[PDB]
Amino acid sequence: HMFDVAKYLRRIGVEGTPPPTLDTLRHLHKRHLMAVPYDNSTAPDRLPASRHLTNVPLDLVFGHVVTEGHGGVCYELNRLFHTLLAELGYDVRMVAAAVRQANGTFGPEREHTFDLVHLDGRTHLVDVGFPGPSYSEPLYLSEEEQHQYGCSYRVTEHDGYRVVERRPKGSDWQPVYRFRPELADPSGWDAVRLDGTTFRSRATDNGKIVLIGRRYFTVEDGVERTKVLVKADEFQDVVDLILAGA
Ligand SMILES: *SCCNC(=O)CCNC(=O)[C@H](O)C(C)(C)CO
């Protein structure tokens, strides 16, 4: 189907057309993460031969995620959300980032794609398309510590980058990803180049649930628990729980 704001809001459980304020942005962001799961299971099926994101019609993505109710990956979910926010009146700018790996280092510079919103003189980070543990409500572009559902966040400056860092209960600060704010671009999605483990996740009311391969992670009010799933029926119950949304 063709991109439609009203249909999208209905998909994520938002009623009416709330006004273009910070309180609305916080609600949209959290509802989107609860309703629309991250899922890379069929991402390669939507890759274009040319590696230019522009050759992937926005309507194809909209059909898969909003009309048919499936999940997607960062350059699908945040691409759609950018378009929704722009239609709702926000000043949204696209930015790319390098992700802190499982080995502790940062990956390629443009692996991850998300957005910034400038509103009433402050800049907020917007990301509804990151598979791992991260923020469910927008962050201020500030090194000042910020708290959401028992987790702490901050956006520090290191070596020409801004670094999103997260600190759950009983753990030290850990980078999530890093980006260059000066490379943000209102039209950045039109320039994105797309040059075996399954990753699925979604937010809950008070945290997030994440399944990478057999590794099942939950955070609830900042309290983390992990379990390497063995049984086939428990594994499928966890997949269904994530993909059904909330
Ligand atoms: S389209 C966005 C691509 N980025 C991406 O898949 C990040 C995956 N990596 C992580 O999420 C992180 O490095 C782990 C493995 C530590 C899990 O959060």
Q: Using an 8 Å Cβ cutoff, are 165 and 147 in contact?
A: no
> Quick one: resolution in A?
1.8
Residue nearest ligand 1's atom 14 by CA: 102
Token pair of 128 as six digits: 């509804």
Q: Characterise 114 by phi-psi region: left (phi > 0), alpha (psi -120 to 50), beta (else).
A: beta
Residue 74: active-site member: yes
* Measured distance CA(194)–CA(13) in Å, rounded: 31
Q: How far is the CA of 74 from the centre of ligand 1 (A)?
A: 10
Residue nearest ligand 1's atom 11 by CA: 132
Alpha helices in 42-172 (DSSP H): 58-62, 74-87
Containing 234, the helix (H) or strand (E) segment is: helix 232-243
* Measured distance CA(170)–CA(172) in Å, rounded: 7
Assigned architecture for domain 5-243: 2-Layer Sandwich (3.30)
Q: Using an 8 Å Cβ cutoff, are 134 and 78 in contact?
A: no
Q: Using an 8 Å Cβ cutoff, are 242 and 211 in contact?
A: yes
* Measured distance CA(2)–CA(239) in Å, rounded: 28
